[model samples]
Target: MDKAYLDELVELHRRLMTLRERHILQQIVNLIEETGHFHITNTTFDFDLCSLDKTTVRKLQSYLETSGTS
Candidate 1:
């Protein structure tokens, strides 16, 4: 992504990373525990959870890609 697009991504999560974000974080954790998809988006972290909607999985994918050092 170019600088502007990357900046937008950064800004999008700037608020999402804070304490208020913890609520969804908990849901993501639960989804991981239920799904058994521990290996997420090329990251070393792993958890198991289940969700038919795939919201948690998609979030993890974007989160790892966005949050990790590039």
Candidate 2:
């Protein structure tokens, strides 16, 4: 087995663990149903689930890298 590939396994796990802040579409759906109004999202929100900012993505990546290193 190659140590290089093994290290990449760790790197891959780090990336996977980073995306923990994903949203539940049902949560948004239920909110719309209960409120009978459009807020938090527009009717066209289906096209773009949410804006994933660079800062938020970077923070998530940093967390995973730190946790994985530990």
Candidate 3:
């Protein structure tokens, strides 16, 4: 990543860590895993089901990346 991008990411990570915020989507994913609500075939289901616009879709992609759900 570029220096500026990495710098910004570092700041965001610092803020999140300081606040001790949890990722709701990750919590839901863990719940699904424990409850057996997800399947191997369910990987792309959320993106298809939501029909989110471009910006939301991008956000979902970012969430999946950071949450380790993808």
| Index of the highest-lDDT prediction | 1
Question: What lDDT is reached at residue 24 by model 3?
Answer: 47
Please identify model 2 stretches exceeding 4 Å from their true place.
Answer: 1-50, 67-70
Name the top TM-score candidate.
1
Candidates ranked by lDDT: 1, 3, 2
**Candidate 2 lDDT score at position 43:** 42
The lDDT of each candidate is: 0.54, 0.43, 0.44
Stretches of candidate 1 off by over 4 Å are 26-70
Better of 1 and 2 by lDDT: 1
- Scanning candidate 1 in windows of ten residues, the lowest lDDT window is 46-55
Tell me the tens digit of each residue's lDDT in model 2 across 1-70.
6676445445644666455644533343453344433334454543211233334334434544456533
Please give the lDDT score at residue 55 for candidate 2: 41
Q: Model 1: per-residue lDDT, tens digit, 1-70?
A: 4576445545544645553556557765766666665655574665333322355546655754556665
Per-prediction CA RMSD (Å) = 11.2, 12.1, 12.1
Q: Worst lDDT window (10 residues) for model 3? A: 45-54
Q: Can you write out model 3's per-residue Cα lDDT over 1-70, one digit (the tens) per residue?
A: 5576445445544544454436645653554344443444645533221222334434434553466545
